[PDB]
Design a protein around this ligand. Sequence first.
Ligand code: BKE
Ligand code: BKE
Ligand code: F6P
Ligand code: F6P
Lengths: 439, 439
Amino acid sequence: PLELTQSRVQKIWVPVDHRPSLPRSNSPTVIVMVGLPARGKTYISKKLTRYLNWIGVPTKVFNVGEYRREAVKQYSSYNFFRPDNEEAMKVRKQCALAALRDVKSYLAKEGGQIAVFDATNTTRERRHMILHFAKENDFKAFFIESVCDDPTVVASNIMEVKISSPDYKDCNSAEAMDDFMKRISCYEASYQPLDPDKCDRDLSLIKVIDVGRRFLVNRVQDHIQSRIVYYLMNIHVQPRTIYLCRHGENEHNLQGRIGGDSGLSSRGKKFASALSKFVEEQNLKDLRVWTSQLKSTIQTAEALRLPYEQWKALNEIDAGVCEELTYEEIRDTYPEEYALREQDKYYYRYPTGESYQDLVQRLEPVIMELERQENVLVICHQAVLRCLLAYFLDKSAEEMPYLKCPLHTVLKLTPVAYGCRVESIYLNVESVCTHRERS
Amino acid sequence: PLELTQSRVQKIWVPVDHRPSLPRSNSPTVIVMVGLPARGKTYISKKLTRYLNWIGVPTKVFNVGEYRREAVKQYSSYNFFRPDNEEAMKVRKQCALAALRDVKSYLAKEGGQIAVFDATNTTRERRHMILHFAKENDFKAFFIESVCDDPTVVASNIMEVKISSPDYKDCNSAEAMDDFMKRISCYEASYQPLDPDKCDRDLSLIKVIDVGRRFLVNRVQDHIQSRIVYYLMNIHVQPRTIYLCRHGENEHNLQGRIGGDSGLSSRGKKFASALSKFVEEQNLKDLRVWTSQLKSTIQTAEALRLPYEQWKALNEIDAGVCEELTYEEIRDTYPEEYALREQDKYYYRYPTGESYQDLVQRLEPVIMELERQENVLVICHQAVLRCLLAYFLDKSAEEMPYLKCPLHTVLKLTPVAYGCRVESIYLNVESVCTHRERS
Ligand SMILES: COc1ccc(-n2cc(-c3ccccc3)c3c(=O)[nH]cnc32)cc1
Ligand SMILES: COc1ccc(-n2cc(-c3ccccc3)c3c(=O)[nH]cnc32)cc1
Ligand SMILES: O=P(O)(O)OC[C@H]1O[C@](O)(CO)[C@@H](O)[C@@H]1O
Ligand SMILES: O=P(O)(O)OC[C@H]1O[C@](O)(CO)[C@@H](O)[C@@H]1O
């Protein structure tokens, strides 16, 4: 016995399945957002979902407000949110129940692992109902409460993403701000914060206090909750810029060879000088510079005359047996391998090498550190850059291997609202094109 | 410009240092343990130090009680700890100040990065003094308080590691327990828990409540504090067993070839059957089985008839250009490389390959998951096993590449007191010997 076969795309050893003539073919989690409006619940929901999906955990946000915008006509005022508004209170409950119905369908019938229930969930009654829903559907419940009553932070959220909401199209900036403040007040009487000391002692929760200055963590049940908690503790909303680029053109680039540890070409050295001038012109307070352990990124960083840190995790995707070969030589020596990759570029593993899937797992610590840091310049490689960019730009596993990241071009990332503003800066130095479109 | 050279041992690209005829040649942290006696402060101190050293952060514990045992004669009773004991109170303060003096010498003059100050530090006055010491020496201060008043947990700590203390050699189990309870009571009046709400609002701290059921986290300043917090949140004291072994003997083992993805030899298949019988005889509640993505570990797990999980992080050390070669062929084709490895086995990086140092970084997520889990069987490879074992057995980077991990032998790890009890179980199946002693 013990007969195994290696799967063609992913290169995984599986038992040879000599299936007879008639062949036969862990618990999901509901993340409950808790808190008054303008407490960054949607910011947390979106960011956490972006991270979880990128690491390979299927996650989806269910925002009760969007179910409400669908059911109700155009928004008039805070009067809709009044506790004495009998009709709207019924509508709002129906919307929450409709979102939960879609949560059940996502987790039990669509292969989803995490459902982020993005609502106020400010009352114990609403949360008791969510817990009942979770228990009878065999879903785990994990609560994330954001507590911040700083008026500057509240006003900043209203100004950055609330006033621009479809609800406030007919309102001006000042009356949307005034309406939203009244809207928050509608929730303040009934608001029962999480109490892990007495009432919510058995609940799995995190209390994010004053934009992540302090945390109350109670009863973390599993791996995924522990990961979420770690992530929430590393992220921040301080202003910053992320610059991402590849090493300057190398000798392998000129020969159309993949992988290797070749040095900068004459043009690559020219880009490196151009990059130093660019960096200088950005006039950044304290820039952290990260490179791979491969020569071409280190030579590029050397031109900056700035301290830099080499990460083995930033090294280009390992092509295994195909290292230092041209794509023509890959097609002619390994035709089966070439066609398999073309068909499934994300999951395809090179023989004795890696997949984009392996890269994501390697780059997880890079992402966690990028979150912690304020200004960073990452000098890396084509496949590495695509992964990092897919995380920041919320791109799927399927689109990730095809993202355009040309040589001698800086990608300037500015975190704004619920994403990244991406600015491209070509440093006017010629190079070959290493981008290959799908077939 | 941009001229680099690759360092012989570690394979790091560095600027060619054309040093002239006259060549010229981040803040440490004091971790402050806080809490009454028998609160697992020494358990936390030792475990955290073991983890931090293993990941490459030089860490040392400074236990004030050991400075006291050195200054004072043999221990008589709790009377030494009385608040009205003027003389012993002076001695105890002197001991704390002597430990801090050694903290300063470790962090500022010995290249240490983290000093774990293991004492009660129960008063605000003592903590104010530690903060003053940290501020004037330019050290960061991070507080770890353990709060647990459960009498079962307190009694268990006294029974497991207190009664066996050199202090209680002349006392019997019952009178050591009675003396220790009186000793704790000496500290209870003056005890001022950390107050991150009002008084300790500006301090960087973690409050570990009821053996890690709940956590209060305030003002995490840097990377290392964030890592510590994550680690404390993943560890537990629930009873469990860790079984570690290599895959059954493979075809490359028979040929004396390194690396590769060869399958089990006839003896390797025999071990796999023997392992299944062994596993069955252990009568474990719920065993998690982990393998690498290499065929030989998967074939071994296949014999168990148990579900298993494949980790790419458990794949054997990458030998780069030396993969699938015998050691004789390495010495004859790459003599410089062979001698360099022999001289510096931990830091040595194989060309286009890895070092034991790279393995530790890869295995960090494995260690974190091993901590979270209760019963686990890890079927892996020689170098991978040495790293994991060095973490559990608190072995240095220098000794790690030489740890004996023979084939067809299970290493049964039982966490007891402040370490691991290691039991070896040879499953009576012959194999070749792949262990190579130093030169
Ligand atoms: C761009 O629009 C934003 C709107 C809101 C936020 N935000 C993010 C947090 C926040 C919460 C926990 C961790 C990190 C940030 C937060 C808050 O605690 N209170 C109000 N607002 C908040 C950020 C951008
Ligand atoms: C083997 O001797 C031990 C002595 C003490 C412990 N211990 C560990 C913790 C503990 C604390 C935080 C996280 C994990 C464990 C703890 C405690 O909160 N209160 C009393 N004791 C304790 C374990 C073994
Ligand atoms: O992105 P692709 O086409 O999958 O391949 C990535 C390749 O691109 C390069 O960065 C250069 O073309 C190589 O280092 C790497 O092998
Ligand atoms: O432990 P060493 O002697 O440094 O080398 C590790 C080698 O041992 C093996 O496990 C077998 O000898 C190989 O897979 C690996 O290359």
